[PDB]
Design a protein around this ligand. Structure first.
Ligand SMILES: [Ca+2]
Ligand SMILES: [Ca+2]
Ligand SMILES: [Ca+2]
Ligand SMILES: [Ca+2]
Ligand SMILES: [Ca+2]
Ligand SMILES: [Ca+2]
Lengths: 627, 627
């Protein structure tokens, strides 16, 4: 009669012996080699109509069980003396807002995180195989849930949405008529810390292009390129990108200390789901793990994947060259035909090119995910770095090659303004359609169909739970916060790479992000399943990617300074000093940008003092056991 | 009747109450608030001749005391299963080469380190002042030895040389007739880990300019600038500096794991000796510490020190301009006088300029050390960073301004070759005279005088100890490994900044370092006192300084490519494409250099596995106390 927290969906053709063996490994206590979780079927009775939903099981636990699981995970809660310490069951009375009759201490995100973590740490010791299935090779030290997922018995494990606390989050989230700081702490308590860091980063990055847009809106309209001759605005833009990328690191440390995930120790990562080698003794841990020879992994990268990426980049350049012949053909068609179709025909080939870019990027994303899931990467952190490298290089190249080809080969700034504005707005509109609005529309149709099916059932089913579980079974799963950072990287690419010749593009990012804060929120609320809460202390490798964009943008902006007609009027006869002065401005901005990233400290002032006290308190505890 | 390890030299005018109070705080046990160290006077009897040496005291301890002190410091020794773990007294039987009757377990360097560490951790609890001295303000939590040093009662605390194990180190150290790998492990066991890391770094850096010298010796003699036109050699030199600065980091982690100081935790640093503020509650530790308002420290830097450094840099440029008028005057005097004094007069003004540089650098070093000891820096790590910044900027500027002024203003490569070779060799010769050879000569005279005084004494003094302690009392103290890294930085500066126009200078570094390995060894053996052993895991901020030299050298070498007569023959008419191609080579080398520093991992492969096992073993221990 408990509250369901995690849903396990078994497959159809599952024998009874495996069901009872799994049920006996869940309910049995922690000292008997079980997991001590409360288990329940979805329905106590069944009729011939609902027999195809007879495999859904709910997993929860009791309060003392969640506290013992909180000791095992290492949740970081606030103490009564305003200090973030690791949670232990023996010292549980010290923490703020805690009673022994308080079910509101551990939030639903941490409770769902602990139950997924206890199913992950469910290992086999005596059993060499799963009873009833030959191919389930079980060695001692292998997770049970991982082998059930890879062998196709457990289809999906997903946490449950809370339909009455989600609406109270949505009431204070969708900003639409008034500027308002987004409630990142309530987002955190509902969605974990990784999803909250992205929404904190999106809310931060929106309030960092407002100086670019406010300065750059009259800088393009009133043409102030006569007075400063492009030196103040280019210098202001590039120094400003470094300042927001350093103040984001300060703000991210401050936020992630307020939640506690700055102090969680690095948990040792198990091999990822889909890493197969030969069974052997792991050298590091001393346990039994799959082993793979390192030379086969290095060969599969640097001889198959890297040539395939190079072929795809060459193929991306080939599609770019096709587009420019289409542009010349359309310009000739504009010279041929008339007066009426003289402005609408000029916007058509960039739109066709924009749609082809956003189709080829998703096609390249599936091929690169497959080609990196084929290389048998061991950890999950390593797999993410290689996938990020392949997809980032191609998306950088495929989106900005055409703008680079216009600016530095044709050298035609009127065509560059038109093409940059059209590419940015069309890619964003097509992004907002394929990311959130069209999947939300398909979900409304699918939700209405399941609801109209459930109200016509003629059974005594408690509908308030079964309808909810059936709806969240067929939702789409969240594939990490990787695409949601990639959209911001390409927006930051379109704004900052060519902010000299077209600063107005900065405004076209801000008017997008005022929707994106809404649109992504809808994508997490009514589109996808609830993602499992995952602790993260920073955005990760994306800090290096955004900073690399701000260094590349120095070279690109300085190359656009040395081609404008304003600066070439300064040195009409001596074109050998213009390049030297532009290179001096380029090296001075690069040196000043790296000094700014090196001068500003990474952690803030008072957070560094609180982290220093927590280290000194832990060092004295070791000293006290010695003393 | 023990073995003396540490000598404490008191002042002359020290009252008897302070002597007995200090002696009662040393001999008393660790539980009674003392230090439990064996204490002894230098001489049991005294005559009227040796009354001025009546304040020297010897401090040692017993074997169980050193093991308990080794638990407090955290020495990292090897276990029997080839694993580096922290030393504890309860698990003392696990470690290699250990008996209960083995005095060769803790080496003399670690024993002298523990005794200095126990005198440092000798705090006052009840006493508000030193008995007999008014000005010794004692608060609870203040070190006793630090206040005795600053108030001028304890003159110096220095460890003792072992005159029979030092000779057995010198027998295998001075290489002179045959190339030989320097014995860094025996250097480590005698001199601590910081001094051993410098000698390991000098031995490494010598075997890294041998490819520069071997390639650059026929590259200058046979003039191969015709065939490659300066592209291969400049690219080879700059990529090679990054490779040795990354393989040094790999080699330093490997060496410092073999000694154990990669795993010693960061000890919390006490305020440095000479930091005075107002007495208050330290916010971090919660103890009582001096506090200083942060705005006064920031004002004393950015309004007094930084203008003084700027005045000294302007004054350094003024001395440089005086030298060039002297060069033109000497060139005119060469045009005036004759044929005979036509080559010796050309080498005189650079030698006069070289002597003035090495005098002004030491004068600037005293002024900058004083000006940074005046800013009241709190920790010692922070004080070292500011002193390194002032001295490095001026030594970089004062040594290479003249070479920059010749290369990029006069643009005269014949004068540049002559001036660079003369500056490098004369600064090194004057460095080797003032660093080690002349202080060794003064020490031989001083040692003979004390020995001839001691053999004519007419007393029953045990001369084998008293002669040794009197000699090491008046030696010079080692002022950190800061000057010894600065010499290598300027050598690396003279080689790599202008390796294009003069690669022969690389050979002039190697023929210096083959002496420097000898010369510095003599400086540590027969010149200075024995330094106290100090643990260090890396060279510190010098990795950033050497890498910054290798990035600056890309820009300087590319600017020397774009001025030679070989490359200007490629583009005779179009001087606007030469700058673009040189800038493209400059940006391609900078991008490839940072990718090389980012691609090669910092820790080696197997050391990373051993450090990962040590983390997993410690994490399981926390898990076992929970389980
Ligand atoms: Ca979007
Ligand atoms: Ca998004
Ligand atoms: Ca920073
Ligand atoms: Ca020297
Ligand atoms: Ca030296
Ligand atoms: Ca590296």
């Amino acid at each position: 009669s408990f509250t369901p927290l995690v849903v396990i969906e078994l497959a159809q053709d599952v024998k009874e012996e495996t069901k009872e063996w799994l049920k006996n490994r869940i309910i049995a206590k922690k000292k008997d080699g079980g997991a001590q979780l409360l288990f329940r079927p979805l329905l106590n009775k069944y009729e011939q109509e609902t027999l195809e939903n007879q495999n859904l099981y709910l997993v929860g636990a009791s309060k003392i069980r969640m506290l013992l699981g909180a000791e095992a995970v290492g949740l970081v809660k606030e103490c009564n003396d305003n200090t973030m310490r690791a949670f232990t069951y023996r010292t549980r009375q010290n923490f703020k807002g805690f009673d022994d009759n308080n079910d509101d201490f551990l939030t639903m995100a941490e409770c769902q995180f602990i139950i997924k973590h206890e199913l992950e740490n469910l290992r086999a010791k005596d059993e060499k195989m799963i009873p009833g299935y030959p191919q389930a090779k079980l060695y001692p030290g292998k997770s049970l849930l991982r082998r059930l997922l890879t062998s196709g018995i457990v289809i999906q494990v997903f946490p449950l949405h809370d339909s009455e606390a989600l609406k109270k989050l949505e009431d204070t989230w969708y900003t639409r008529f008034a500027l308002k700081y987004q409630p990142i702490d309530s987002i955190r308590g509902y969605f974990g810390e990784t999803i909250a860091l992205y929404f904190g980063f999106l809310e931060y990055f929106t309030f960092a292009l407002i100086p670019m847009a406010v300065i750059g809106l009259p800088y393009y309209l009133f043409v102030w390129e006569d007075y400063d001759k492009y030196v103040i605005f280019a210098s202001f833009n590039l120094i400003w990108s470094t300042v927001i990328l350093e103040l984001w690191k300060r703000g991210c440390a401050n936020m992630t200390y307020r939640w506690g995930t700055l102090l969680m120790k690095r948990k040792f990562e198990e091999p990822r789901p889909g890493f197969h080698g030969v069974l052997g003794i792991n050298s590091i841990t001393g346990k039994e793990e799959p082993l793979y020879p390192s030379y086969k992994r290095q060969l599969r990268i640097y001889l198959v994947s890297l040539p395939f990426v190079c072929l795809c980049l060459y193929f991306s350049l080939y599609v770019m060259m096709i587009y420019f012949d289409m542009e010349v053909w359309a310009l000739g068609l504009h010279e041929n035909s008339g007066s009426e179709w003289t402005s609408v025909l000029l916007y058509v080939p960039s739109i066709i090119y924009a749609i082809v870019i956003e189709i080829m990027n998703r096609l390249y994303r599936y091929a690169a995910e497959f080609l990196t899931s084929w290389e048998n990467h061991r950890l999950e952190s390593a797999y993410q770095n290689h996938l990020i490298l392949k997809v980032l290089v191609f998306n950088f190249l495929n989106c900005f090659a055409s703008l680079f080809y216009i600016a530095f080969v044709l050298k035609d700034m009127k065509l560059l303004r038109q093409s940059l504005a059209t590419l940015l707005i069309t890619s964003q509109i097509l992004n907002q359609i394929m990311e959130s609005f069209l999947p939300y529309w398909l979900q409304r149709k699918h939700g209405v169909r399941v609801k109209r099916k459930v109200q016509a059932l003629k059974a005594d089913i408690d509908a308030t739970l079964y309808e909810q579980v059936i709806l969240e079974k067929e939702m789409g799963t969240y594939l990490g916060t990787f695409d949601d950072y990639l959209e911001l990287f390409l927006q930051f690419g379109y704004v900052s790479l060519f902010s000299c010749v077209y600063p107005l593009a900065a405004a076209f990012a801000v008017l997008n992000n005022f929707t994106e804060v809404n649109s992504d929120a809808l994508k997490m609320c009514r589109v996808f399943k609830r993602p499992f809460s995952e602790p993260s202390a920073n955005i990760g490798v994306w800090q290096l990617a955004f900073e690399t964009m701000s260094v590349i943008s120095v070279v690109t902006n300085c190359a656009l300074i040395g081609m404008s007609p304003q600066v070439n009027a300064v040195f009409p006869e001596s074109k050998a000093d213009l390049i030297l002065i532009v290179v001096a401005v380029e090296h001075a901005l690069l040196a000043l940008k790296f000094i700014l990233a090196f001068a500003i400290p990474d952690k803030p002032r008072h957070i560094q003092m609180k982290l220093a006290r927590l280290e000194f308190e832990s060092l004295e505890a070791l000293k006290q056991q010695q003393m």
